[PDB]
Symmetry: D2
């Protein structure tokens, strides 16, 4: 019996995800937004407190991801490619600025399992973003000034977010993007009678990213809407105002995860 996630198996192949390292290359459409600070605060776990400066601020990101591990798994895009929609919300952890992730959607079961392991609360969703093609022409925007990109996310056949950005200029400090560490919650419940309120795993974690790299980063304007949907609570973070729109490539590797609190 071998393997990292379930199913464990004789050969350690069938598992949804193998052990790290997990490598990621992706292209991000992001939108800075502002919701009601109290609504942001309602989503925070114990151990996180409202950002004293930017309470209500969040980032919405629509990402086209390609995953690999140690054996050119990206040559199997049927399993290794996926698309992702998440939000983070500004908060503080012990007087430090962080980014809390309450909701996140992917179109891939391997990504869902990897996410749970990291404490990303992934559900399945349908996620799309406009692509820029080098060849150019009327089927594509320019990755440059004036370039317009749309992005959407649905869950269980219901549209939950729609965005558009228009690029204006290159990001001045690419390395500054996502300067806030991301905070998640590893959580795995018990089913034994009498223990449904006593999870086996329940711990705040900080995301740890190795060898992080950003390229081709642009900033501009943005439009964003969250839409009410049965069985979802995203739209309970209403978009009162949109800030900057962002487009960039992102790469990193996962090998670790920092447990803060159990």
């Amino acid at each position: 019996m071998k393997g990292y996630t379930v199913p464990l198996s004789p050969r350690g192949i069938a598992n949804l995800a193998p052990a790290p390292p997990w490598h990621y290359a992706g292209t991000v459409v992001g939108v800075e937004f502002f919701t009601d600070p109290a609504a942001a605060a309602a989503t925070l776990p114990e151990g996180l407190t409202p950002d004293p400066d930017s309470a209500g601020r969040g980032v919405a990101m629509f990402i086209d991801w390609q995953y690999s591990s140690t054996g050119l798994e990206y040559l199997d895009p049927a399993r290794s490619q996926y698309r992702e929609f998440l939000i983070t919300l500004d908060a503080h952890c012990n007087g430090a600025p962080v980014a809390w992730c309450p909701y996140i959607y992917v179109d891939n079961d391997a990504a869902m399992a990897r996410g749970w392991v990291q404490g990303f609360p992934k559900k399945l969703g349908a996620v799309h973003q406009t692509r820029a093609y080098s060849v150019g022409g009327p089927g594509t925007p320019v990755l440059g000034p004036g370039g317009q990109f749309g992005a959407t996310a649905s869950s269980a056949g219901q549209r939950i977010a729609e965005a558009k950005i228009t690029l204006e200029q290159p990001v001045p400090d690419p390395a500054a993007l996502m300067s806030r560490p991301v905070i998640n919650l590893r959580h795995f419940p018990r089913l034994a009678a009498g223990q449904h309120d006593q999870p086996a795993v329940h711990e705040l974690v900080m995301s740890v990213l190795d060898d992080t790299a950003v390229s081709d980063a642009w900033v501009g304007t943005a439009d964003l809407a969250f839409l009410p949907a049965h069985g979802e609570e995203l739209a309970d973070l209403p978009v009162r105002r949109t800030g900057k729109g962002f487009h960039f490539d992102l790469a990193y590797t996962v090998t670790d995860l920092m447990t803060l609190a159990d």
Copy 2:
């Protein structure tokens, strides 16, 4: 912060699955099969032992499920309905006959989450079974003698099982064993899972109706990223068809 599974949330609605009770109603197309005893034994967790009498026996099941909880969730079929393929293998637990589940596939993320909590090692797949309709006619088999039912399962766009049964007669006890498993990602701990425990599936208010038995054809197909077909079908036993209903509120840690 409220909720049973992630995402936890202010209202406890966003979670993939709320707390039990979980209620199920389903229709099963199933195939008794026999593989190499040694290949079956290779899949067994430490706490289980080969069945002294029927080592190599297993059961393949394709199920059209409908789930609900305490609020008529079955009125939301886009979430509550799912289709499932699983196999179990005969084994023993302390001299008592049980059914070990090594592989199982569903087409619903809520089901996948509920599964993991029960220790069912669910992955996503595409599962289908022939349905019987009471109106009858050339678009449907009869649910009765001569009725033919097909079923298939795929994962990541690859077919892994194909089956057919032919019903012959109406029908005139092995608990399922699973492994709750949740790994750690902290460096140095990737071999030290936070949850790793053998469990027995506990089912409340179980009911079976409309059970038929007959013949069966079955194949497992090799697929990248899967090991189901490492359990070759040397032969089939009975095919079977029935409705099944039960409620989950509990789980026994072994």
Copy 3:
């Protein structure tokens, strides 16, 4: 070069659908509804007129279908099973009551192709209906008084219909438009096929029919016009099994 629909092929296997007969067995969750007569009339093809008595009335149906042809194709549910949401609207054809189908969605490409040949204007979508299981219990409604069924339809990741019925009590030809455009420059407004047809169903059977109360809404969606037939009020909800065979189609 064999086959009925594309792709044509050396063996006539690859086609999306072979020649009729096409057999169907299904379970229908449906809602009678009423929209604005003008909105319904705006969808009518040349050759159909408003119904003088029930203009505005329509029927919404969510169906779990199983198809087969001459070779027990229902043993291949990955191709043969599908789910369908459609509406019809009351109208007249030369003075006779008919049911015009403006919009229909299915979750299967074989079904789309069969539909197109019949003149059902199918697009892909995600369609779901509550199922009644004979075993009973808390995971299923019970067919009969008080049995509740939900149903939904989405298109391109957008919800476009939501419905619920409550059963209480036991218990018009469809007109379509075969339409295939031309792409030759100068001919984009001159379709190669454009003909009003009446649906012809062989050996039709209905069973275990119930009626009761209903709720129904069509939701606005980008790229869709269903919700431009707003539900002003609902009539009967209904539930039944349906079977028929298709071998023919009547050109009008």
Copy 4:
């Protein structure tokens, strides 16, 4: 009643696809292959002739497409983006080299409709290709020498093609890529009793492309197999050997179609 394809409608929005122009931008992973001449011949419509020089040769392509029309439809990727797998086979049309398309798969119903109108015989399938990311790192190949790219296609949950290419050098003559015009067959049957063998539309066509452009074109080595599947005949064109592998961006516009 407005619209181009069905459904026709009061505003001409609901239709699967509106009238042309249809614009395309995509990234192609391609494999030159060789099957049995007689197998290729078997798929040919009346009107086409085996190629006297390269009978049995074809090209398999996996493409990540983005479509748009006159209103920035590419801002709605849920509808406008799709993935496509097709093969063409070398043939002749009246002494001239062409490329016959027998089978093609897409993961989008609007593409299926546009395809049928063009005579592309589209079915639904699931198609994927490895992508190159500019940022680089262990999650991506390099778009350059040594870059490896995989690709797969499935139909109805069955795998029907798997491919990998390894790039070596720039395509010497990008303009010449797929210089063979594609031949298709517009086909629409009748359902009236007695007419099931008398289709309403049945005509050989040549694909017409406007403003075609290619960029970032690379060539290298390739591996490819077609797999037997129920209800498919692709694998009846068995890959006996592979030739070149190709990677390039492709863009064009569709406004016309030539009936042969």
